[PDB]
Amino acid sequence: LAKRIIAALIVKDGRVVKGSNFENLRDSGDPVELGKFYSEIGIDELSFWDITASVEKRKTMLELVEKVAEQIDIPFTVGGGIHDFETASELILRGADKVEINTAAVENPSLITQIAQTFGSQAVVVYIAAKRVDGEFMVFTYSGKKNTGILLRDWVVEVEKRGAGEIVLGSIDRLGTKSGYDTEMIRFVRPLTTLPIIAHGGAGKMEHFLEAFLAGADAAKANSVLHFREIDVRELKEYLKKHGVNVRLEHHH
Template sequence: MLTKRIIPCLDIKNGRTVKGVRFEDIRDAGDPVELAALYAKQGADELVFLDITATNEKRKTLVELVREVARYIDIPFTVGGGISAVEDVEVLLQNGADKVSVNSSAIHRPELITELASRFGSQCVTVAIDTKSTPEGWKVFSKAGTVDTGLWALDWAKEVVERGAGEILLTSMSNDGTKNGFALDITGEISRNVIVPVIASGGAGNEQHFLDVFEAGADAALAASIFHFQEVPLPGLKKFLAQNKIDIRC
Protein backbone atom coordinates (compact mmCIF):
# COMPACT_ATOMS: atom_id res chain seq x y z
CA MET A 1 0.00 0.00 0.00
CA LEU A 2 1.04 3.55 -0.64
CA THR A 3 1.76 5.02 2.79
CA LYS A 4 0.86 8.39 4.24
CA ARG A 5 3.90 10.66 4.40
CA ILE A 6 5.29 12.58 7.37
CA ILE A 7 7.27 15.61 6.23
CA PRO A 8 9.42 17.76 8.52
CA CYS A 9 9.77 21.27 7.13
CA LEU A 10 12.98 23.19 7.57
CA ASP A 11 12.68 26.96 7.17
CA ILE A 12 16.02 28.25 5.92
CA LYS A 13 17.51 31.70 6.29
CA ASN A 14 21.10 32.35 5.24
CA GLY A 15 21.82 28.64 5.30
CA ARG A 16 20.42 28.02 8.80
CA THR A 17 17.17 26.45 9.97
CA VAL A 18 14.62 28.75 11.54
CA LYS A 19 10.96 28.47 12.44
CA GLY A 20 8.61 31.38 12.77
CA VAL A 21 5.71 30.89 15.11
CA ARG A 22 2.81 32.34 13.15
CA PHE A 23 5.51 33.45 10.66
CA GLU A 24 6.84 36.21 12.92
CA ASP A 25 8.80 35.22 16.01
CA ILE A 26 11.84 33.37 14.64
CA ARG A 27 14.02 30.91 16.57
CA ASP A 28 17.19 29.10 15.39
CA ALA A 29 16.84 25.32 15.26
CA GLY A 30 20.18 24.28 13.83
CA ASP A 31 22.15 23.20 10.82
CA PRO A 32 19.89 22.11 7.94
CA VAL A 33 21.98 19.21 6.62
CA GLU A 34 22.56 17.77 10.08
CA LEU A 35 18.91 18.12 10.99
CA ALA A 36 17.85 16.61 7.64
CA ALA A 37 20.11 13.59 8.17
CA LEU A 38 18.65 13.09 11.64
CA TYR A 39 15.10 13.22 10.30
CA ALA A 40 15.92 10.80 7.48
CA LYS A 41 17.36 8.37 10.03
CA GLN A 42 14.31 8.76 12.28
CA GLY A 43 11.97 7.81 9.45
CA ALA A 44 10.92 11.08 7.81
CA ASP A 45 9.33 10.20 4.46
CA GLU A 46 10.36 13.42 2.75
CA LEU A 47 11.72 16.82 3.67
CA VAL A 48 10.73 20.33 2.67
CA PHE A 49 13.22 23.20 2.69
CA LEU A 50 11.61 26.60 2.62
CA ASP A 51 14.07 29.40 1.92
CA ILE A 52 13.15 32.74 3.46
CA THR A 53 16.45 34.47 2.71
CA ALA A 54 15.84 37.87 1.14
CA THR A 55 19.32 38.90 -0.01
CA ASN A 56 20.91 38.93 -3.46
CA GLU A 57 23.09 36.02 -2.43
CA LYS A 58 19.93 33.98 -1.93
CA ARG A 59 20.04 31.85 -5.04
CA LYS A 60 23.69 30.86 -4.69
CA THR A 61 23.34 29.94 -1.01
CA LEU A 62 20.21 27.90 -1.73
CA VAL A 63 21.83 25.96 -4.56
CA GLU A 64 24.80 25.14 -2.32
CA LEU A 65 22.43 23.94 0.39
CA VAL A 66 20.44 21.80 -2.06
CA ARG A 67 23.67 20.20 -3.24
CA GLU A 68 24.81 19.39 0.29
CA VAL A 69 21.42 17.95 1.21
CA ALA A 70 21.36 15.78 -1.92
CA ARG A 71 24.91 14.61 -1.20
CA TYR A 72 24.10 13.29 2.27
CA ILE A 73 20.36 12.57 2.34
CA ASP A 74 18.82 9.53 0.67
CA ILE A 75 15.15 10.50 0.86
CA PRO A 76 13.27 12.93 -1.44
CA PHE A 77 13.12 16.64 -0.72
CA THR A 78 11.26 19.68 -1.97
CA VAL A 79 12.65 23.20 -2.13
CA GLY A 80 10.51 26.33 -1.98
CA GLY A 81 10.70 30.02 -1.27
CA GLY A 82 10.76 32.85 -3.77
CA ILE A 83 10.94 30.61 -6.84
CA SER A 84 9.51 32.50 -9.80
CA ALA A 85 11.35 31.40 -12.96
CA VAL A 86 11.98 28.26 -14.98
CA GLU A 87 15.75 28.90 -14.71
CA ASP A 88 15.59 28.90 -10.87
CA VAL A 89 13.91 25.52 -10.94
CA GLU A 90 16.33 24.04 -13.46
CA VAL A 91 19.36 24.78 -11.30
CA LEU A 92 17.69 23.39 -8.15
CA LEU A 93 16.67 20.15 -9.86
CA GLN A 94 20.08 19.78 -11.49
CA ASN A 95 21.68 19.97 -8.07
CA GLY A 96 19.57 17.22 -6.58
CA ALA A 97 16.22 18.64 -5.46
CA ASP A 98 13.33 16.30 -6.29
CA LYS A 99 10.53 18.84 -6.30
CA VAL A 100 10.10 22.58 -6.06
CA SER A 101 7.21 24.42 -4.51
CA VAL A 102 5.86 27.68 -5.85
CA ASN A 103 3.41 29.93 -4.07
CA SER A 104 3.07 33.72 -4.61
CA SER A 105 4.71 33.56 -8.03
CA ALA A 106 2.04 31.12 -9.20
CA ILE A 107 -0.72 33.42 -7.95
CA HIS A 108 0.95 36.35 -9.69
CA ARG A 109 1.47 34.41 -12.93
CA PRO A 110 -0.43 31.08 -13.04
CA GLU A 111 1.17 30.20 -16.42
CA LEU A 112 4.35 29.47 -14.43
CA ILE A 113 2.80 26.20 -13.22
CA THR A 114 2.20 25.01 -16.77
CA GLU A 115 5.67 26.09 -17.88
CA LEU A 116 7.29 24.13 -15.05
CA ALA A 117 5.10 21.07 -15.57
CA SER A 118 5.75 20.85 -19.29
CA ARG A 119 9.47 21.44 -18.88
CA PHE A 120 10.21 19.21 -15.88
CA GLY A 121 7.08 17.09 -15.41
CA SER A 122 4.17 17.53 -12.99
CA GLN A 123 5.80 15.18 -10.50
CA CYS A 124 8.29 17.85 -9.46
CA VAL A 125 5.85 20.77 -9.27
CA THR A 126 4.28 21.34 -5.86
CA VAL A 127 2.02 24.35 -5.52
CA ALA A 128 1.90 25.77 -2.01
CA ILE A 129 -1.41 27.36 -1.04
CA ASP A 130 -1.67 29.51 2.08
CA THR A 131 -5.26 29.73 3.20
CA LYS A 132 -7.16 31.46 5.99
CA SER A 133 -10.62 30.91 7.32
CA THR A 134 -12.72 34.05 6.74
CA PRO A 135 -16.40 34.68 7.50
CA GLU A 136 -17.12 33.95 3.81
CA GLY A 137 -15.05 30.78 3.72
CA TRP A 138 -11.47 29.60 3.07
CA LYS A 139 -9.55 32.14 0.98
CA VAL A 140 -6.04 32.20 -0.47
CA PHE A 141 -3.54 34.64 1.01
CA SER A 142 -0.13 35.62 -0.34
CA LYS A 143 2.97 37.39 0.95
CA ALA A 144 3.22 35.30 4.13
CA GLY A 145 -0.47 35.60 4.86
CA THR A 146 -0.75 39.38 4.62
CA VAL A 147 -2.50 39.83 1.27
CA ASP A 148 -5.99 38.52 0.52
CA THR A 149 -5.81 37.38 -3.11
CA GLY A 150 -9.56 37.20 -3.50
CA LEU A 151 -9.24 33.55 -4.58
CA TRP A 152 -11.22 30.76 -2.94
CA ALA A 153 -8.93 27.99 -1.71
CA LEU A 154 -10.88 25.17 -3.36
CA ASP A 155 -11.14 26.97 -6.72
CA TRP A 156 -7.45 27.81 -6.73
CA ALA A 157 -6.53 24.23 -5.80
CA LYS A 158 -8.56 22.91 -8.75
CA GLU A 159 -6.99 25.47 -11.06
CA VAL A 160 -3.37 24.69 -10.11
CA VAL A 161 -4.00 21.00 -10.74
CA GLU A 162 -5.54 21.78 -14.11
CA ARG A 163 -2.45 23.82 -14.91
CA GLY A 164 -0.14 20.93 -14.13
CA ALA A 165 0.66 20.87 -10.40
CA GLY A 166 1.62 17.38 -9.25
CA GLU A 167 0.97 18.03 -5.57
CA ILE A 168 -0.59 20.64 -3.28
CA LEU A 169 0.98 21.86 -0.05
CA LEU A 170 -1.95 23.34 1.83
CA THR A 171 -1.09 25.54 4.80
CA SER A 172 -3.82 26.89 7.01
CA MET A 173 -2.60 30.24 8.28
CA SER A 174 -5.47 30.15 10.77
CA ASN A 175 -3.99 27.03 12.37
CA ASP A 176 -0.25 27.55 11.81
CA GLY A 177 1.63 27.95 15.08
CA THR A 178 -1.39 27.22 17.27
CA LYS A 179 -0.58 23.53 17.90
CA ASN A 180 -4.34 22.96 18.07
CA GLY A 181 -4.48 20.64 15.08
CA PHE A 182 -4.67 20.85 11.28
CA ALA A 183 -7.54 22.49 9.38
CA LEU A 184 -9.46 19.27 8.81
CA ASP A 185 -12.43 20.62 6.86
CA ILE A 186 -10.60 22.47 4.07
CA THR A 187 -7.86 19.82 3.85
CA GLY A 188 -10.44 17.08 3.40
CA GLU A 189 -12.49 19.11 0.95
CA ILE A 190 -9.54 19.90 -1.31
CA SER A 191 -8.16 16.37 -1.08
CA ARG A 192 -11.51 14.94 -2.22
CA ASN A 193 -11.74 17.38 -5.11
CA VAL A 194 -8.33 17.11 -6.76
CA ILE A 195 -6.58 14.08 -8.27
CA VAL A 196 -3.11 14.96 -6.93
CA PRO A 197 -1.75 14.31 -3.41
CA VAL A 198 -2.41 16.96 -0.75
CA ILE A 199 0.06 17.76 2.03
CA ALA A 200 -1.61 19.24 5.11
CA SER A 201 0.34 21.90 6.96
CA GLY A 202 -0.20 24.22 9.91
CA GLY A 203 -1.37 23.45 13.42
CA ALA A 204 0.23 20.11 14.33
CA GLY A 205 0.71 19.88 18.09
CA ASN A 206 0.46 16.19 18.95
CA GLU A 207 0.19 12.68 17.51
CA GLN A 208 -3.61 12.70 17.46
CA HIS A 209 -3.59 15.73 15.13
CA PHE A 210 -1.74 13.69 12.48
CA LEU A 211 -4.18 10.82 12.83
CA ASP A 212 -7.10 13.27 12.51
CA VAL A 213 -5.77 14.87 9.32
CA PHE A 214 -5.00 11.53 7.64
CA GLU A 215 -8.51 10.34 8.50
CA ALA A 216 -9.79 13.62 7.01
CA GLY A 217 -8.13 12.68 3.71
CA ALA A 218 -4.64 14.23 3.64
CA ASP A 219 -2.01 12.23 1.76
CA ALA A 220 0.85 13.69 3.76
CA ALA A 221 1.30 15.95 6.77
CA LEU A 222 3.95 18.56 7.35
CA ALA A 223 5.21 20.16 10.55
CA ALA A 224 8.27 22.04 11.73
CA SER A 225 8.83 23.20 15.30
CA ILE A 226 7.25 20.18 17.00
CA PHE A 227 9.91 18.09 15.26
CA HIS A 228 12.75 20.59 15.69
CA PHE A 229 12.13 20.88 19.41
CA GLN A 230 11.34 17.17 19.75
CA GLU A 231 7.89 17.76 21.17
CA VAL A 232 6.56 15.00 18.88
CA PRO A 233 9.43 12.61 18.06
CA LEU A 234 9.11 11.02 14.60
CA PRO A 235 9.59 7.33 15.47
CA GLY A 236 6.89 7.45 18.17
CA LEU A 237 4.54 9.36 15.88
CA LYS A 238 4.84 6.78 13.11
CA LYS A 239 4.33 3.93 15.56
CA PHE A 240 1.22 5.64 16.94
CA LEU A 241 -0.21 6.07 13.43
CA ALA A 242 0.54 2.46 12.49
CA GLN A 243 -1.21 1.27 15.68
CA ASN A 244 -4.20 3.34 14.63
CA LYS A 245 -4.47 1.58 11.26
CA ILE A 246 -2.89 4.30 9.14
CA ASP A 247 -0.70 2.93 6.33
CA ILE A 248 2.67 4.26 7.36
CA ARG A 249 6.29 3.33 6.71
CA CYS A 250 7.97 2.29 9.97
Protein backbone atom coordinates (compact mmCIF):
# COMPACT_ATOMS: atom_id res chain seq x y z
CA LEU A 1 0.00 0.00 0.00
CA ALA A 2 2.68 2.44 -1.04
CA LYS A 3 0.68 5.10 -2.87
CA ARG A 4 1.30 5.14 -6.62
CA ILE A 5 1.73 8.02 -9.08
CA ILE A 6 0.50 7.04 -12.55
CA ALA A 7 1.25 9.04 -15.69
CA ALA A 8 -1.65 8.90 -18.16
CA LEU A 9 -0.92 9.51 -21.85
CA ILE A 10 -3.57 10.08 -24.51
CA VAL A 11 -2.33 8.63 -27.80
CA LYS A 12 -3.54 8.59 -31.41
CA ASP A 13 -1.79 7.10 -34.45
CA GLY A 14 1.19 6.35 -32.20
CA ARG A 15 1.57 10.00 -31.12
CA VAL A 16 1.05 11.64 -27.73
CA VAL A 17 -1.94 13.93 -28.23
CA LYS A 18 -0.65 17.48 -27.51
CA GLY A 19 2.87 16.12 -26.74
CA SER A 20 4.96 17.29 -23.80
CA ASN A 21 7.42 19.99 -22.75
CA PHE A 22 10.40 17.66 -22.19
CA GLU A 23 12.85 19.23 -24.63
CA ASN A 24 15.53 16.72 -23.58
CA LEU A 25 13.58 14.07 -25.51
CA ARG A 26 14.44 13.46 -29.15
CA ASP A 27 10.69 13.29 -29.85
CA SER A 28 8.55 14.89 -27.13
CA GLY A 29 5.50 13.38 -28.86
CA ASP A 30 6.79 9.78 -28.85
CA PRO A 31 4.69 7.84 -26.29
CA VAL A 32 7.42 5.19 -26.00
CA GLU A 33 10.24 7.64 -25.28
CA LEU A 34 8.05 9.78 -23.02
CA GLY A 35 6.88 6.74 -21.06
CA LYS A 36 10.46 5.50 -20.78
CA PHE A 37 11.54 8.89 -19.45
CA TYR A 38 8.72 8.90 -16.88
CA SER A 39 9.76 5.43 -15.72
CA GLU A 40 13.33 6.67 -15.21
CA ILE A 41 12.35 9.73 -13.14
CA GLY A 42 10.11 7.86 -10.68
CA ILE A 43 6.63 7.34 -12.20
CA ASP A 44 5.19 4.14 -10.73
CA GLU A 45 2.96 3.03 -13.63
CA LEU A 46 1.94 4.22 -17.08
CA SER A 47 -1.53 4.35 -18.61
CA PHE A 48 -2.19 4.72 -22.34
CA TRP A 49 -5.60 5.79 -23.68
CA ASP A 50 -5.92 5.45 -27.45
CA ILE A 51 -8.35 7.37 -29.67
CA THR A 52 -7.22 6.16 -33.09
CA ALA A 53 -9.81 5.92 -35.88
CA SER A 54 -11.54 2.57 -35.69
CA VAL A 55 -10.13 1.07 -38.90
CA GLU A 56 -6.48 1.49 -37.88
CA LYS A 57 -7.13 1.34 -34.13
CA ARG A 58 -6.71 -2.39 -33.47
CA LYS A 59 -3.35 -2.63 -35.26
CA THR A 60 -2.30 0.74 -33.83
CA MET A 61 -2.90 -0.24 -30.21
CA LEU A 62 -1.13 -3.58 -30.71
CA GLU A 63 1.96 -1.86 -32.14
CA LEU A 64 1.91 0.52 -29.16
CA VAL A 65 1.94 -2.10 -26.40
CA GLU A 66 4.61 -4.07 -28.26
CA LYS A 67 6.90 -1.03 -28.46
CA VAL A 68 6.18 0.05 -24.87
CA ALA A 69 6.79 -3.42 -23.40
CA GLU A 70 10.27 -3.73 -24.93
CA GLN A 71 11.37 -0.36 -23.49
CA ILE A 72 9.79 -0.03 -20.04
CA ASP A 73 9.83 -2.35 -17.04
CA ILE A 74 7.19 -0.72 -14.80
CA PRO A 75 3.53 -1.81 -15.17
CA PHE A 76 1.41 -0.22 -17.85
CA THR A 77 -2.28 -0.22 -18.71
CA VAL A 78 -3.85 0.22 -22.16
CA GLY A 79 -7.40 1.37 -22.81
CA GLY A 80 -9.73 3.13 -25.20
CA GLY A 81 -12.55 1.33 -26.97
CA ILE A 82 -11.68 -2.15 -25.70
CA HIS A 83 -15.03 -3.78 -26.40
CA ASP A 84 -14.60 -7.55 -25.92
CA PHE A 85 -12.45 -10.37 -24.58
CA GLU A 86 -10.47 -11.06 -27.73
CA THR A 87 -9.36 -7.43 -28.06
CA ALA A 88 -8.33 -7.35 -24.40
CA SER A 89 -6.54 -10.71 -24.78
CA GLU A 90 -4.38 -9.74 -27.77
CA LEU A 91 -3.32 -6.53 -26.01
CA ILE A 92 -2.24 -8.32 -22.82
CA LEU A 93 -0.47 -11.07 -24.76
CA ARG A 94 1.35 -8.48 -26.89
CA GLY A 95 2.81 -6.74 -23.83
CA ALA A 96 0.26 -4.86 -21.74
CA ASP A 97 0.05 -5.68 -18.04
CA LYS A 98 -3.53 -4.48 -17.59
CA VAL A 99 -6.47 -3.32 -19.68
CA GLU A 100 -8.76 -0.40 -18.81
CA ILE A 101 -12.44 -0.71 -19.73
CA ASN A 102 -15.50 1.43 -19.11
CA THR A 103 -18.42 1.52 -21.54
CA ALA A 104 -18.19 -2.14 -22.61
CA ALA A 105 -18.06 -3.27 -18.98
CA VAL A 106 -21.18 -1.27 -18.05
CA GLU A 107 -23.09 -2.73 -21.00
CA ASN A 108 -21.81 -6.27 -20.29
CA PRO A 109 -20.43 -6.68 -16.76
CA SER A 110 -19.56 -10.33 -17.45
CA LEU A 111 -16.73 -8.98 -19.63
CA ILE A 112 -14.88 -8.11 -16.40
CA THR A 113 -15.23 -11.73 -15.29
CA GLN A 114 -14.22 -13.08 -18.70
CA ILE A 115 -10.90 -11.23 -18.82
CA ALA A 116 -10.13 -11.99 -15.16
CA GLN A 117 -10.76 -15.73 -15.69
CA THR A 118 -7.81 -15.92 -18.12
CA PHE A 119 -5.53 -13.07 -17.03
CA GLY A 120 -6.36 -12.63 -13.35
CA SER A 121 -8.26 -9.89 -11.58
CA GLN A 122 -5.00 -7.90 -11.47
CA ALA A 123 -5.19 -7.42 -15.26
CA VAL A 124 -8.68 -5.81 -15.27
CA VAL A 125 -8.96 -2.10 -14.47
CA VAL A 126 -12.49 -0.67 -14.61
CA TYR A 127 -12.68 3.07 -15.29
CA ILE A 128 -15.81 4.54 -13.67
CA ALA A 129 -16.71 8.02 -14.91
CA ALA A 130 -19.15 9.54 -12.44
CA LYS A 131 -20.96 12.85 -12.00
CA ARG A 132 -23.40 14.41 -9.55
CA VAL A 133 -26.95 14.48 -10.96
CA ASP A 134 -29.92 15.65 -8.85
CA GLY A 135 -27.93 15.02 -5.68
CA GLU A 136 -26.71 11.51 -6.58
CA PHE A 137 -23.43 10.21 -8.01
CA MET A 138 -24.31 8.71 -11.44
CA VAL A 139 -22.29 6.48 -13.79
CA PHE A 140 -21.67 7.88 -17.28
CA THR A 141 -20.56 6.09 -20.43
CA TYR A 142 -19.49 6.98 -23.99
CA SER A 143 -16.89 9.57 -22.99
CA GLY A 144 -19.31 11.25 -20.60
CA LYS A 145 -22.17 11.51 -23.12
CA LYS A 146 -24.67 9.07 -21.54
CA ASN A 147 -26.16 9.12 -18.06
CA THR A 148 -26.64 5.40 -17.47
CA GLY A 149 -29.07 5.96 -14.60
CA ILE A 150 -26.89 3.55 -12.60
CA LEU A 151 -25.77 4.77 -9.18
CA LEU A 152 -22.03 4.92 -8.55
CA ARG A 153 -22.61 3.09 -5.26
CA ASP A 154 -24.26 0.16 -7.05
CA TRP A 155 -21.73 0.00 -9.90
CA VAL A 156 -18.72 -0.03 -7.56
CA VAL A 157 -20.11 -3.00 -5.64
CA GLU A 158 -20.94 -4.87 -8.86
CA VAL A 159 -17.51 -4.15 -10.36
CA GLU A 160 -15.75 -5.83 -7.42
CA LYS A 161 -18.25 -8.71 -7.48
CA ARG A 162 -17.52 -9.33 -11.18
CA GLY A 163 -13.80 -9.73 -10.42
CA ALA A 164 -12.12 -6.41 -11.30
CA GLY A 165 -8.65 -5.77 -9.89
CA GLU A 166 -8.66 -1.97 -9.61
CA ILE A 167 -10.99 0.99 -10.16
CA VAL A 168 -10.09 4.30 -11.76
CA LEU A 169 -12.54 6.77 -10.25
CA GLY A 170 -12.93 9.60 -12.76
CA SER A 171 -14.82 12.72 -11.69
CA ILE A 172 -16.36 14.31 -14.79
CA ASP A 173 -17.07 17.38 -12.63
CA ARG A 174 -13.28 17.81 -12.25
CA LEU A 175 -11.82 16.58 -15.56
CA GLY A 176 -9.56 19.28 -17.01
CA THR A 177 -10.10 21.91 -14.31
CA LYS A 178 -6.86 21.98 -12.23
CA SER A 179 -9.13 22.58 -9.21
CA GLY A 180 -8.13 19.43 -7.30
CA TYR A 181 -9.25 15.83 -7.06
CA ASP A 182 -12.88 15.12 -6.19
CA THR A 183 -12.06 14.07 -2.65
CA GLU A 184 -15.75 13.97 -1.67
CA MET A 185 -16.31 11.35 -4.39
CA ILE A 186 -13.23 9.35 -3.33
CA ARG A 187 -14.42 9.38 0.29
CA PHE A 188 -17.86 8.25 -0.90
CA VAL A 189 -16.42 5.26 -2.77
CA ARG A 190 -13.71 4.23 -0.27
CA PRO A 191 -15.87 2.25 2.23
CA LEU A 192 -17.73 0.50 -0.61
CA THR A 193 -14.82 -1.50 -2.01
CA THR A 194 -11.62 -3.25 -0.96
CA LEU A 195 -10.12 -2.73 -4.43
CA PRO A 196 -7.40 -0.16 -5.16
CA ILE A 197 -8.87 3.23 -6.03
CA ILE A 198 -7.06 5.34 -8.65
CA ALA A 199 -8.13 8.99 -8.56
CA HIS A 200 -8.55 10.67 -11.93
CA GLY A 201 -9.60 14.21 -12.77
CA GLY A 202 -8.75 17.67 -11.46
CA ALA A 203 -5.02 17.52 -10.65
CA GLY A 204 -3.39 20.94 -10.56
CA LYS A 205 -0.77 21.16 -7.83
CA MET A 206 1.17 18.83 -5.55
CA GLU A 207 -1.18 19.48 -2.63
CA HIS A 208 -4.05 17.92 -4.58
CA PHE A 209 -2.27 14.55 -4.44
CA LEU A 210 -1.90 14.74 -0.65
CA GLU A 211 -5.62 15.52 -0.35
CA ALA A 212 -6.49 12.62 -2.64
CA PHE A 213 -4.45 10.18 -0.57
CA LEU A 214 -5.98 11.50 2.66
CA ALA A 215 -9.37 10.82 1.07
CA GLY A 216 -8.44 7.15 0.59
CA ALA A 217 -7.11 6.86 -2.96
CA ASP A 218 -4.40 4.24 -3.43
CA ALA A 219 -3.05 5.91 -6.56
CA ALA A 220 -3.39 9.15 -8.50
CA LYS A 221 -3.54 9.42 -12.29
CA ALA A 222 -2.14 12.63 -13.77
CA ASN A 223 -2.04 13.85 -17.36
CA SER A 224 -1.19 17.38 -18.61
CA VAL A 225 0.11 18.70 -15.26
CA LEU A 226 2.94 16.21 -15.86
CA HIS A 227 3.40 16.55 -19.63
CA PHE A 228 3.39 20.35 -19.45
CA ARG A 229 5.61 20.17 -16.33
CA GLU A 230 3.31 22.12 -14.05
CA ILE A 231 4.21 19.43 -11.48
CA ASP A 232 7.53 17.59 -11.32
CA VAL A 233 7.29 13.89 -10.44
CA ARG A 234 10.46 13.93 -8.32
CA GLU A 235 9.44 17.08 -6.42
CA LEU A 236 5.97 15.56 -5.95
CA LYS A 237 7.20 12.33 -4.36
CA GLU A 238 9.60 14.37 -2.19
CA TYR A 239 6.66 16.51 -1.05
CA LEU A 240 4.35 13.56 -0.36
CA LYS A 241 7.04 11.66 1.57
CA LYS A 242 7.82 14.83 3.54
CA HIS A 243 4.21 14.99 4.78
CA GLY A 244 3.75 11.33 5.74
CA VAL A 245 2.60 9.68 2.49
CA ASN A 246 4.18 6.28 1.79
CA VAL A 247 5.52 6.59 -1.77
CA ARG A 248 8.41 4.90 -3.43
CA LEU A 249 11.32 7.28 -3.96
CA GLU A 250 13.87 4.74 -5.03
CA HIS A 251 11.34 -12.86 -15.29
CA HIS A 252 9.01 -15.81 -15.80
CA HIS A 253 9.20 -18.46 -18.53
